[model samples]
Target: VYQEPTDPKFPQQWYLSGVTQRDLNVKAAWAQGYTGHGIVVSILDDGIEKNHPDLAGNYDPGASFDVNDQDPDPQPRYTQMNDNRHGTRCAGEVAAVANNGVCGVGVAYNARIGGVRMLDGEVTDAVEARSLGLNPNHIHIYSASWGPEDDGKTVDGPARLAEEAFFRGVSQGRGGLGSIFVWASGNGGREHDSCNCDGYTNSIYTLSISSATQFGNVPWYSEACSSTLATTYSSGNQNEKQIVTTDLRQKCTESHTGTSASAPLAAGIIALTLEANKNLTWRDMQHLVVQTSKPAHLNANDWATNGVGRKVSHSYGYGLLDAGAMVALAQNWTTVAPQRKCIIDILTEPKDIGKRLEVRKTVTACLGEPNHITRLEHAQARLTLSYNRRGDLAIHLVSPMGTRSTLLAARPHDYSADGFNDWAFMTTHSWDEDPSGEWVLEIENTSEANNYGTLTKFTLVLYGTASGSLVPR
Candidate 1:
C-alpha cells in the first residue's frame, strides 16, 4: 500500500525501507495516511537551519527559539568547520519534507519542525530550563541528543532550574497531558560508559533511545544500561552506512551518525503516534513503547524477560521501534491509571564498603490510600555513597520477583574520588514487578582493595500505578 517518496536520498535511508530488511515500518504508517500531521517536535540543540530546502516546508516559527542568542531565530551560525550542523541533521530526521527532492523523507515528514538554539554558547542551567520549558503547549515532543561528556567519567544531568523545568513539563505541559521527552542514550560504548551515571537518560521522565546497526546489531558507539527504553537504527562500525539527513547551508549529508541520529528518529515516530491519538500522557507514551517495541533482529548479547512477561535488554531496553505497530496500538489505547509513588529505605546510616557489602529491606510498596504502587514502571536506588576509586564499585538491586537490575557497572575510566553524592541510580529491568517482600542491594568491589569506601544511604523510589488491571489494548 505504500510507495517510495520522490526524494533522491530516500533509497539510502535503510531504516525506513523494507528493501534492506531494516524496517521500522515507518512507510507502513505513511501508507495509512499518518505522516505525523498535527504534531510538533522541537529539537533542543545548537541550532537548526529552518531555511534548508528539505526542512523549510515543515518548519514552525512558534516552536523555534534561541536561548543562546536571546532571540526568536533558531538558525545556526555559519562557521568554517560547521560544528553547528547537528540540529539541522536531527530536525530533518523528524520533519524533513517528503517527496520534495531535497534530501530524504523524515520519519514524520508532515510534522512541524522547530529548533531551540541553546548549545552554541555557554550552556547554563537557565538556558536548559528555557529551552525545555519553551511553549510546552505548542511542542508535543522535545528531542535532545546532546548530554554530558562521554568520557566515561562525567556523571551529570539537569541542574536545579532544569530539573524543575523537567517536572513542570511532565506534570503540566500539554493541557495536563504531559510532555514527551525523547532523549538519545549516549554514544559511549567505545569508552565503556554506563548510562546509569548519566542522570539525563536514567530519569523516569525521559524516554531514552539506543541505536542498532544496519544489520540490527548493537552499534559500536552505543552505551548499554538498564535505563534504555527502546532502539532505533543509526550509523555503525566502519564500512556500515550512516544516517542520511538535511545539513546546514541548505545541504544534505549521508554522514549523520551515532545516538544523535537515533533519537530524532524516535521523536519522529512518537510524533506519528501522537498524531494518531493526541490524548496520550507522558507515562502512556512509555507504556506504548514497552508494549509495542519489537525484539526481533536486534542482536544484543543480553536479552531477557523482566518480572512481567515482556522482554527487555540492557542495550535495547524493549527493542527496535516499530512505527506501524506503535501507531496501530496508539489508536485504540485508553489512558493509564494515575501515577503512584512509594519510597522505602534500604540503608540510612553509613556502612563501610569492604570486599563485599549487602543490604536488605522488605517493602510493601506503601499500600495505602493514595501513594501506593502495585504494577510498576520506574524504579531507582537513590544512593549516597563515596569511594576512593569510584570505578571499582558495582551496585545491583534484586526485586522480589528475582529480577536483578544492574544499577552500576565498573567503569575503568571513572577514577574520580568524588563518588555519587545522593545520586539516583535508576533501572528499567524490574518493570511491572511487585514491590513486596525482601529486596536485596549489593555493592561489590571489582578492582583492588579500597579502604575508604562508604555507603552513606540507599533509598528505593518506586513509581507506578495503583491499578492492578492493564489498559485496554
Candidate 2:
C-alpha cells in the first residue's frame, strides 16, 4: 500500500476546510470520523485499481465481482483495456482513503471498495452484479458512473439489465436488496437523457446523480432529468473544469465527462452516512439522502447549476447532495412515519389530464396522534379524500388557484344525505397552468378523536352512504 504526505490542511475538515454545504456537507460529516467505515461501496464501470496504493488496502477482493470476465477480479489493469480508464477515476472520488497524502481525499476513506467491472466489458456482466449472492459480502452502496447514452431508448442491454437489478434490490435491505444505487444522470442536455421529464430518474427506484461544474454551475453538456435524486461536482471536456479524485495511474484519462464522476462522489457521501448509522436500512438511506439534499439553481433557459436558485432542476432531482446536512440530519433526526395515503381504490384508472383530483393529505408526522379542530364550517374539502382515519372528520372545499379561497364549508350534519348540503362539493380550483390545476383541502378532526395508531395501511371511504342523516341546517 502507498501512503501520501500527512499534511493537515484542515485538521477537522472532511473535504472543505469549513462547512461549505457541498453535496450535503459530506466533507464536514467525514471530518467527524464518518468516512463510511464498515460500509461497502460497489462500483460497476470500466474497472478499478485492485492494488492501487491509495485504494488497495480497502479493496474487498471477496466482494469485488467482475461481470465482464466472469471472474472475481475487477482489476483496472484487466477490464480497462479499450476505454480511457474512466471507472478507476470515478472510484477514486468515493473510496480513496485519507492521510495517504496523494490523491486528495475520497468521501468515505475507510469504507470497503468493490466493483462489477462492466463499462468497456459486456452487458451480461452487469446483469450478474444485479443478482444477489454474486458476492457473499453484502454491498451497501452500488455506484455506477456509466449508463446508456440514451435514457429514452436504452441501446445497451446491459445498462437496462443493471437498471432492472437496481429497482429489484431497492424493493426490499442493505446492499443490492436496499443498497443506495447512484447513477450518473448523463451529461446529455435536452437531446441527451431527456431527463427534463420524469422518464428515467423518476423510476420509483434508482437515485440518479447529476453533475455541476466548478464554476458551481451546471456544465453546458450536463443533462438535467426531472427529479434528479442528487448532484455532485465533475470535470468538463474543456475549460472551467470540475475538480475530482481518481486513481493515480499516469495512464488514466486526465479529463472525465458524463454523470459518471458525479455519481460516485454522491455515493461516497452516502457511505459516510451509513458509517455513522450501521443500522440504517436501504429505505432509511434513501429517505435521508433525498429529504436532506440541497437545491441547485436553474438558468432562465433551463439548466441546473450550483448557485442560489440552483434550487431544483427538472433534471437535477432535489438539487445537490448536501453530505453535511444529510449526516447531521441522520445523527439527530427521528424517523417520521411515512404519509398515510390509500390509493388502492381511489385512483383505479388514469387521472384526467386536466381534471383536479382533490384528496386530503394529513401530516404523517402527527401519525397516531390526534389534534382537535372543531366546527364544520372550518372544514376543508372532505369529498374525494381517501385517507384512513378513525375520527369523525369533515372536509371543506378550497379554490385551486393562486389565491386559495374556501368555496364550501362542511355542514355540521352529514352533507351526503341532505339535498342542500349532502353533496360534497368539488374544489373550486381551475385547470389553468397545469390544466390539471392545484387545489387545497383540509380534514378537520371534528370529533377530537385520536389520530395516532393509524398504521401504514388504512382505508378512505369515498362514494359511500352513511347510515346517519346528513342534513344541512
Best prediction by TM-score:
1
What TM-score does model 2 achieve against the real structure?
A: 0.63
Q: Distance from true position, residue 251, model 2, in Å? A: 6.0
Cα lDDT tens digits, model 2, 272-354, are 88777766655466557655666544222433332112233444455667777777767764543332221112233322211
The lDDT of model 2 is 0.50
**Which regions of candidate 1 fall more than 4 Å away from where they truly are?**
468-473
TM-score of each: 0.97, 0.63
Per-residue lDDT of candidate 1, residues 58-120 (tens digit): 999999999999999999999999999999999999999998778888999999999999999
